[PDB]
Structure formats: C-alpha cells, structure tokens
C-alpha cells in the first residue's frame, strides 16, 4: 500500500520559518519524483514544483522561487518542504504528491499540512449573551487561535443548536456565535447556559443566557 | 490566470450527467495528451480520476469519463450522485518537467429543494455595552442553495465599515447557514434610530431590524 503521511498543523508568525515533512511507505522512494501542491483558503490547487529523488535536484515553479526548499532524507524515505520569510498569505494547506509517470502524475497524495501564518497571539474569548419558539445564543468574541467548541447545558441541549464558523477580523482575531431555538414557554423556567471551550488558551466559559 | 480554463461552477440534479470543460490557453501544453483530472472533497486529499485525457484508473467509478476536442478537454460525470459534489481540477504537463492545474470547478448536486433564509438579528448585549463595545449579530440559517450576500443599514444609509461576514457552511440538517457581524461603538449604536441586516438569496431579500 502506497502511503504519503504528512506532519501536523503549524502556526507561525510572519518572518518565521517552517519545515513540513512527507513520510512515504509502500514503494521504492528513489524511483519516483515527489511534487508539492498548495491550496490557499478559497483558492485552487497550485503546483509548486518537484524534487528528483534519483539526483536530489529540485525544480520550482515561478512564484515558489526564492524562499522555498524541497529536500528529502533517504534513510527515512521522507521528503521535506521548508519555507522562509513567512507571511500571512502563505496560510495554506500544503500537499505532497507522487508522480508515477508523465502519463500518471499525482497518483498518490499526502493528507495535507495546514500552515497558518498570523501576527496575532493567543487570546481567550470574551463571551456575551444573546438574550431571547424563541432564539437565544452566545457571542464568543475576539479569540485566537482556532478552535472553539460550544455546548449548551453541558450537552443536555442538542436539538436546534447551530454553532457558526468564525469570522477572521482585520485584527487577526476570531469570533463566532452559537444559537439555540427553544420554546417561548420555557423561558423563565429552564436555565440556558452555553459552555464555551477554547483549549489553545486553557479557557472555558459557562455563560448563563437569561431573558432581557 | 491559469493556462487551463475551467468554469468556476457547474450544477446538476441527481441522476443527470454534467460536463466540465478545460481549455488550454497556451501552446506549452504541446500535443495536449497529458491531461489528468482530480476530484477534491473538503478535508481530504485530491483523488486522481482521469489521466492521459481519457484513461480511468482502478478505483474511479465508470461514471467518470474524459474526452478532448481540439484544445478543450472535458470531464463528463454520468448518473450524478450526491457524493459527487466536490471540486474538480484538470491538469496538464506544460513542458520542461512542469505541470499546471486548472482553476478548479465547484460541482453542486441539487438534491434538495430551494429554501429562503431565516434571519435572526441580535443587538449588542447589555454586558458588552458595559464593556464599551457593541456588536450586531445577524445569524442566517436554513437556506439553499448555499450563497448569500449581506448588507447592513444604519437607519437607511448602508454601512460597509465594521462588517465581517462568514462564508456559508453546511448545517446538521443539510441546509446552509452563515453569519454577519457589524462592529460599532456604543455611541454609534445609540446614535441611530435603528440598524438593519439585509440578507439577499436568489435575488430576493429578507431584512431584520433592531432598535436600541
């Protein structure tokens, strides 16, 4: 079984470096070229280049010249992608992909490595109530980085819940909302609490949402 | 400005067949017989489904076929199914051991009736106002297809400043949802007679208003 397994997600500051790995198994590593492909948010795949695993020579596409390095280590059948002078617009998923032949390129793909570049620093959320079949929710404001998970009444309230994905503001910080639809007659009897969890900041918030 | 031109989007209803074109804009494709296609589901590695214009690898269903007429290569999917909803990329060798991807095509499978959005608008919470901040939260849910635009109004004038809007994302029930935020100072919030959130979907509009 041919397998390309990439390293995990990265979070970097502008001006920093990053090195992504692509470990292979299930074929003779030096028989086939290793290619790299980038997908920025809301964009297509872009071929970045390849490295010749017989000779070691790398070939870079225009636009990936200057600060990108393809390499490999034959003792562990792993290829690498190094990027310097990182900037926000380098935020993308980076894939390795094998080329079997001119007729059969990119037959096997790594699962991708997300590299996020942001100038923002870790910050826990400010949770505010969205007071109220009535709808009520919680506003999870100005946090970084992702992810935030939200539950209601410690998970005892599931039907009619939707946690929206977050917006990335100009400040680099994330915000999201969670809303639940409940019967009007329940207000003033049932207590409603959103449980916000922001692991990256070791923060949890239980915010009671009551009528006003 | 890829050298391979694909339509941005195509749609079809379950059971139909659809065609995605891929026209080469330059002679660097040469004979244009090294053309491959990839299916890309979110969160997953791209999958090779056609190579050498028309050859189908083992693993790709026989519902996927590739053809070429002149400098336009075409992917045809027969008996469209819900799980075909994905991004599709054509790809060509472009000489000197280099490759290029087309811009990609988003294939939507219309296996669901159209539904107008439900909109709930929340004013700034008391707690947030007491923290000298103010956020309008416009939550949009249960709409299909998954495309909306949002506009804000302070009384009657439009407001682009301070607006952050998410891209639509699938709900649990399979319909789409999105959110929009308008950031204001407590002064601005109390400065106007009302604020409104205007959601446009398939050419029609639903507007919610809140008042301090």
């Amino acid at each position: 079984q041919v397998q390309l397994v990439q390293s995990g997600s990265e979070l970097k500051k502008p001006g920093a470096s990053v090195k992504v790995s692509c470990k292979t198994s299930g074929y003779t590593f030096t028989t086939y070229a290793m290619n790299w492909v980038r997908q920025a948010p809301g964009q297509g795949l872009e071929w970045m280049g390849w490295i010749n695993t017989n000779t070691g020579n790398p070939t870079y596409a225009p636009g990936f010249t200057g600060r990108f390095v393809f390499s490999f280590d034959t003792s562990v059948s792993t290829a690498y992608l190094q990027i310097s002078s990182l900037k926000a617009e380098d935020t993308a998923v980076y894939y390795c992909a094998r080329v079997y032949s001119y007729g059969v390129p990119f037959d096997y793909w790594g699962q991708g490595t997300l590299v996020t570049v942001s100038s923002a620093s870790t910050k826990g959320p400010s949770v505010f109530p969205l007071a109220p079949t009535a709808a009520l929710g919680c506003l999870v404001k100005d946090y970084f980085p992702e992810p935030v998970t939200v539950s209601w009444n410690s998970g005892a309230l599931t039907s009619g819940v939707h946690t929206f994905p977050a917006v990335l503001q100009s400040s680099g910080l994330y915000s999201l909302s969670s809303v639940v639809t409940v019967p009007s007659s329940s207000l003033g009897t049932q207590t409603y609490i959103c449980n916000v969890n922001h692991k990256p900041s070791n923060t949890k918030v239980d915010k009671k949402v009551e009528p006003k | 400005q890829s050298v391979l031109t694909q339509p941005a989007s195509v749609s079809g209803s379950p059971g139909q067949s659809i065609t995605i074109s891929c026209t080469a804009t330059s002679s660097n494709v040469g004979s244009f017989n090294l053309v491959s296609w990839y299916q890309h589901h979110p969160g997953k590695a791209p999958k090779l489904i056609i190579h050498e214009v028309s050859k189908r690898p083992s693993g790709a269903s026989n519902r996927f076929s590739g053809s070429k007429s002149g400098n336009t290569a075409s992917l045809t999917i027969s008996g469209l199914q819900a799980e075909d909803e994905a991004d599709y990329y054509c790809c060509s060798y472009v000489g000197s051991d280099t490759w290029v991807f087309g811009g990609g095509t988003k294939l939507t499978v219309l296996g669901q009736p159209k539904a107008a959005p439900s909109v709930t608008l929340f004013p700034p919470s008391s707690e947030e106002l007491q923290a000298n901040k103010a956020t309008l939260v416009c939550l949009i849910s249960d709409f299909y297809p998954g495309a909306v635009t949002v506009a804000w109004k302070a009384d009657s004038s439009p407001v682009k400043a301070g607006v952050e809007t998410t891209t639509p994302s699938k709900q649990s029930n399979n319909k789409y949802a999105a959110s929009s935020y308008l950031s204001l100072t407590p002064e601005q919030w109390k400065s106007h007679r009302s604020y409104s959130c205007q959601v446009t979907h398939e050419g029609s509009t639903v507007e919610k208003t809140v008042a301090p």
Partner: peptide, 13 residues
C-alpha cells in the same frame, strides 16, 4: 511531449 510511460525521475547526466 514526452512518452506517457516514461518516468521524469531520472538522471539527465
């Protein structure tokens, strides 16, 4: 273009 059965991952000398 090149032979589709050929392999680009070769020594050019």
């Amino acid at each position: 273009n090149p032979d589709p059965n050929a392999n680009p991952n070769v020594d050019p000398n």
